[PDB]
């Protein structure tokens, strides 16, 4: 399990020195709980409850798949183990749920709202710290796809690593032997002009920072006309309306961190008997 | 330093395999850089920020204190240190710091909308995975105080706990010798009845679970009648604006964990020169 | 599971590089053996030996629970597991199954002198390092109760702390608001008029520190009048003898953390048979 | 380095969530620390200490070294840093303090009542969990000598190794060859015949459990006389009352492991000033 | 800093339980030494080594850059620093200094015949445990470049994938919307007509497995016509005599991991003086 | 257990941010798989893999034992899991296989080329940084035997330790009671003369290193002559070439470190069906 210590340190900063619950209990013995919701919407950190509850010694009779959507007063997990151990589990699981399914949800909108099966919806490396994973996996039970998920994974560069390089084509050359070479290069561009010193130079991949639809489709021409072989994002704020109106800039894929740093939690609660 | 680990880890999610900048790199110097906001509000995880920094050997030259306001356009911070070591950090610092503040600043505005200096505000277990210390230190930086840390910081419980109990009295007397000398029992009420066999039993708080004023008064003022040295504490949803109408139902302090599961980040970003 | 990680570096300091023994066994085989007394004593150690056997691979036959009394010769545990593994668990296992019960057995020792079912025993903050939690676990089989565990357990003020306040009362106060919702306050004093003072200023919890049984009785007394829900606890060298006078003195608890810093090994040992 | 890690572990499990004066705490500033002794006896734990102050950014002013000897009120050390921390670090680097000189001491009484420039004394494997290199260090200190410290250290038979090797001096032929190069092996022994065998087997060093001073004697001789280069330690329950007696008897070691798990906490305390 | 934690452990192993010579050692005392070549050969190690020092508190005095030629009898490092502690990082200094430029040295000897400024020569992912970074990092400083370092870096698919793949091209196609965004797919292909499918399917980089130069030079040819941009690199037991007939050949990159696998340690010492 | 760690390790190094053929794979499944060699020699590794393939739950169906031999061709292992998983593990359990047999592979060659079943082959301390106990764990198998593991398990003093000695056989004399009463000392030697010296100083092992087979012959001779239990190490740049030669001269054992600082991967590959 490559998520097995995430779990394992989510549960002891709620746990400190201990429960203190299970310090009172007299005689324990072995019940079961479900896991309503309280508003409708996806689900998504199936995975990790179910990791967290196998590594608690908590057996997980029911479950709604990932990806799956739900309505209120709905039964997501039927889990039964012993009694002080399901309390003590009880918070660290409806947390982590929680989260990744309101990032979900959250994104599940963003998906409808962009109508479309030719174009990509991207995250951004906009996460909160210790959850870079954790949060992807959610972006992506939503309906979209993973931009990259660190600095190691393709080398994507800015106006900030270049206003101090001269002749950018040849940059771009002496990376490529001093880089992995299964290694992307994609550039972040603020105008058309830049578009071109960019594909001529050989970038991978080339975005689009705040820029209206008729400044991105004078690239995304430029683009079909030499240089197709060239991905195209779109990448600026992008709000869940100003959104489909790119889907049409005849762009590969359009990236919205918002998807992340703007999800708030879903309602939910465990219950015993 | 006891969050020294929580950055290192922060910064490995997202360096991975190693920056793959560095490698194309050619001769790396020493620049500055700040972190202007684009979005007015408050300011929290300068502790975190600044722990980060000097484990990078990254200079902290200006730094604008925690729980401090600021307006868009505004400097955050004056850093300085190697270029290359300037970019791996950048990321994992706005993030931090974002999130950190956008709880800070969700946290502010349910402050004033209080609008008292007799009540508490309090927050909840309900945090993110791996952030229990990171986000209550954040509901902090806005005005508020933290309610319990963990699970190990004060035996409190609710009904999924009595609903196999016979005598409460009794119950809270023979927990107190097999608990530590220094935790207080709060106990979770969902009607006027209960609030009285709580008291009566011991209890050292008694909450309100999704209760209207005039069903808390009723204890709020069965309090101030016989047992008097017993705080009181309002929580059950407590929108950001039916809040102020409960700092008035007389009770000591009132818990909004939506303080911490619904605030976004906050734009901020960072500029070399 | 919260004990894993404990057991796991109690096992790795003794292997170090790896046992030599299992280098030249020829034939492992499996076997059974047993752990016994060679002295008297109360059992502690349970949780801990279980998990370090089912943790190893070697099935526990039968075990004594924790808290019981046993003589000299008496059989305390059978084991069965390859013999090699045996050998290695060996002094990991008996090691702290006499460490532990030998606190809980001089903890005992001292229960009785105390004699009473209306005043606890309390160990104190002064732990061996490392083993905190561990040896706190052993006082309570040892028929007392533990005081706080940390730090941030709950707030406790001694000279040290005082030397650099003015006006106590009008500290504790803006000090709520900064303290964890359910933490309680406790001041150590060295006489009357500074027992009084704590009260007054709203401490939760005074400590008679090095005072005469007749100056308790006094800080006692004047407790039961005019602040009837405030602890209080005696403490500073208390002995075997001169504990039980205390107990009789209208005093709350009795914190003798001689119980730990005090208390040496019980004598056991493991055969094959 | 070695042993910060000990450290920032003995650390953490007090601090816990966080310390809690630090919160109430208004303004921190530097300030002086001495750690007084409160009762007499031998200095150990410098090396520790020294690191836990170090590594926790306190300045250590003046100390005493390992192994001087100290009488009460005696100012131990001088320590400066900034006034919360002190305090954080206050109980720890006592509990050690204590905990390493407890031992330390009770050793130095056998090495007095040992008195012989020429036979070692030697602790044991019976240690604390997790302290196995704290407290043979403590040992040290004492004045006495260490035996192996772990399983990896050196090979040791005891009869339950035996119990199932028919020929022994080929078995011990037959393990060097396994065994790292450079490891010595002793074979505990309960008679003059056994300690006859295992020498012509080639045992490395031979244990003289539990036998009489006279059958010691015996041994040392048949040692002296045919097997010159072979090493003796006489163990068992050992005693003050019997140390010089078995001192005198041709043996190169007295092994008793009564040194640790049966010392206990020096009382010492720090005071601000 | 990432490599701390590498070297830590690889001094931990080493100490084990702690130096032994630090304990007869009388007194310490700053002293110098130097690292010295024993054989020619390029130096590697310079990033890892001077962590390693700075770490423990050794002053680094001289040193030759990473990817730098040495002949025997050459001072490679001029030290300062304890002499206890000099001895302690001793071996594992060297150790390390040998693996890392002995993998870099071998590396020259293929980058030589190899000759060409076209082609590039690549590792791969047959690496010794836990060294993949390490050793990646000695291929840089053997004049070569590295293929990627992970399975998350970039997707490659050889016949164990595909032998459960129906219709490839298909395949290709429903993947990149689970992919992250910047990868590539590469494909292991041992034949021609394998090579056309794969490309065709939309392979970013194919494989020119266990294939005569021909078979290359056609699998070549064909792409510079149909697929243009497309990447191909050959592999599979490529020697020091045959890899350079492969340069000529029009294929983008070569990979003989034995540059890793197949390197040893080059001779080097360290001298007082 | 032990390694479990050292694997665990291993993985996450590969693994990275994740796999991401398990991202694009459509419906996972159980298979076998076979390890098939390419290379003939001696299987080392047993141990680790069992531990590897139980600890990611694949099942191991058949196994060779460490120390047989293989031909080409030879089926090695069968496994059998989850088709994804097989994958991610595939790699990692070739490597290090391969390093593993690698080094017992080249071992058993000066085994066989040494040739006596009364002197012993040894390694050294010169290993891979993070693998000193799995390189001698290699080494053991291909028939040779381990020397010490680290600094901890004896110790040794070169000429460097020396240069301050005035007076070895008091150095000697009065540091046996500091180092723990287990250990052996073995000093290097140049010279008949050292080594007639470092003997009467009490030595336990005598180095003698580079010297004509002659010397060594000398110094055999003195040992069996005046000082039978002293135990003889030959060691310098010793090869196939030479090993015999030496075998032939008196001394205990022949020391080559370039058993391990020389070996290479064993070709070998895996296989579905
Ligand atoms: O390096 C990454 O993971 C990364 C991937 C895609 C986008 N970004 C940055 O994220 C910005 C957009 O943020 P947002 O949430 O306001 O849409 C974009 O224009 C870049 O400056 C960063
Ligand atoms: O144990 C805790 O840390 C804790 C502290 C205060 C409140 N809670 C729970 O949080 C609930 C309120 O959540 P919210 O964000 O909708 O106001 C409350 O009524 C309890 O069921 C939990
Ligand atoms: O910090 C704590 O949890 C704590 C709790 C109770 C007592 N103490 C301290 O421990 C002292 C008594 O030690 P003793 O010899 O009675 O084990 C007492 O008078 C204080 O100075 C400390
Ligand atoms: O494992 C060791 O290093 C070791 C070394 C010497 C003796 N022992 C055992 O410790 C026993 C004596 O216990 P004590 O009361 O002197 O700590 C002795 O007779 C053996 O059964 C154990
Ligand atoms: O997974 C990788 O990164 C990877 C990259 C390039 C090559 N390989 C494998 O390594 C093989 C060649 O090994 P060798 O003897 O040329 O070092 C090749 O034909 C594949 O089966 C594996
Ligand atoms: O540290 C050890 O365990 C150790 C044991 C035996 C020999 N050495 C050193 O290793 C040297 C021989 O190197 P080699 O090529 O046989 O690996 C020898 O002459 C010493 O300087 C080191």
């Known amino acids: 399990?490559?998520?097995?210590?995430?779990?394992?340190?989510?549960?002891?900063?709620?746990?400190?020195?201990?429960?203190?619950?299970?310090?009172?209990?007299?005689?324990?013995?072995?019940?079961?709980?479900?896991?309503?919701?309280?508003?409708?919407?996806?689900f998504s950190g199936?995975?990790?409850?179910?990791?967290?509850?196998?590594?608690?010694?908590?057996?997980?009779?029911?479950?709604?798949?990932?990806?799956?959507?739900?309505?209120?007063?709905?039964?997501?997990?039927?889990?039964?183990?012993?009694?002080?151990?399901?309390?003590?589990?009880?918070?660290?699981?409806?947390?982590?749920?929680?989260?990744?399914?309101?990032?979900?949800?959250?994104?599940?909108?963003?998906v409808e709202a962009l109508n479309s099966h030719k174009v990509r919806l991207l995250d951004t490396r906009k996460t909160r710290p210790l959850l870079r994973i954790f949060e992807k996996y959610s972006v992506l039970n939503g309906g979209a796809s993973n931009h990259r998920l660190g600095l190691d994974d393709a080398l994507m560069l800015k106006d900030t690593h270049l206003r101090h390089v001269k002749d950018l084509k040849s940059f771009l050359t002496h990376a490529r032997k001093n880089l992995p070479f299964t290694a992307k290069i994609e550039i972040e561009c603020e105008s058309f002009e830049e578009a071109k010193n960019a594909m001529?130079?050989?970038?991978?991949?080339?975005?689009?920072?705040?820029?209206?639809?008729?400044?991105?489709?004078?690239?995304?021409?430029?683009?079909?006309?030499?240089?197709?072989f060239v991905l195209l994002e779109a990448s600026g704020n992008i709000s869940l309306e100003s959104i489909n109106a790119y889907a049409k800039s005849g762009v590969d894929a359009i990236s919205v961190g918002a998807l992340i740093h703007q999800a708030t939690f879903i309602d939910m609660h465990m219950k015993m008997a």
């Open 46 to 110: 199936e995975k990790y409850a179910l990791e967290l509850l196998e590594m608690t010694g908590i057996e997980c009779v029911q479950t709604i798949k990932d990806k799956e959507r739900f309505k209120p007063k709905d039964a997501l997990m039927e889990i039964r183990g012993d009694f002080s151990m399901l309390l003590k589990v009880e918070r660290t699981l409806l947390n982590l749920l929680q989260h990744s399914s309101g990032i979900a949800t959250l994104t599940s909108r963003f």
């Open 200 to 228: 001529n130079a050989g970038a991978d991949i080339v975005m689009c920072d705040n820029l209206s639809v008729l400044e991105t489709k004078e690239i995304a021409a430029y683009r079909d006309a030499h240089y197709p």
């Open 1 to 42: 399990m490559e998520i097995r210590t995430f779990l394992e340190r989510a549960l002891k900063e709620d746990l400190g020195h201990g429960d203190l619950f299970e310090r009172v209990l007299e005689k324990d013995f072995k019940a079961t709980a479900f896991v309503r919701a309280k508003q409708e919407g996806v």
